């Protein structure tokens, strides 16, 4: 399959982690 | 055992001149120690687990 590094595997996960937090922050902020 | 089988097998081997490089290892092509009844039983345990969980979720979905 597609060959990817280990840090990008690390990075994409952090990107997913931070992004969900942004949605939660955005969602609550807009709900105010 | 029929002694004529020596001749049949001997003649049959002599036919191998035409398929040099791809002679079949074994003429007696004709077993899973795992019994078919037990193999089906093992399937009923493992495969279904994903399927049933979906159905139970479906049951809780209505």
């Amino acid at each position: 399959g597609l060959k990817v590094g280990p840090v990008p595997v690390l990075v994409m996960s952090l990107l997913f982690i931070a992004s969900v937090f942004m949605l939660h922050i955005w969602g609550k902020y807009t709900r105010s | 055992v029929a002694k004529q089988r020596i001749r049949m097998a001997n003649e049959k081997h002599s036919k191998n001149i035409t398929q040099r490089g791809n002679v079949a290892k074994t003429s007696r092509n004709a077993k899973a120690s795992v019994g078919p009844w037990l193999l089906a039983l093992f399937i009923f345990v493992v495969c279904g687990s994903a399927i049933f969980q979906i159905i139970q979720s479906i049951r809780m979905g209505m």
């Binding site: 937090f21 939660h24 922050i25 609550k28 | -």
Partner: protein, 66 residues
């Protein structure tokens, strides 16, 4: 008695085999047992502590967010 012995024998043999197997196992020694316990106990604590703390930090963040 045959049908009973047909069912009894595989059971009876299995118990005998189990006893036979256990006597042949190299059971851990007292020094071996203590050594393994310390390593497992440490790993149990290190791993739980990390999760414990990680869980404790999130609680306020989760409640504050939600």
């Amino acid at each position: 008695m045959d049908q009973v012995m047909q069912f009894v024998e595989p059971s009876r043999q299995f118990v005998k085999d189990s006893i036979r197997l256990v006597k042949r196992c190299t059971k851990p020694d007292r020094k071996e047992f203590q050594k393994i316990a310390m390593a497992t106990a440490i790993g149990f604590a290190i791993m739980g502590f990390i999760g414990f703390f990680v869980k404790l930090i999130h609680i306020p963040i989760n409640n504050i967010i939600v």
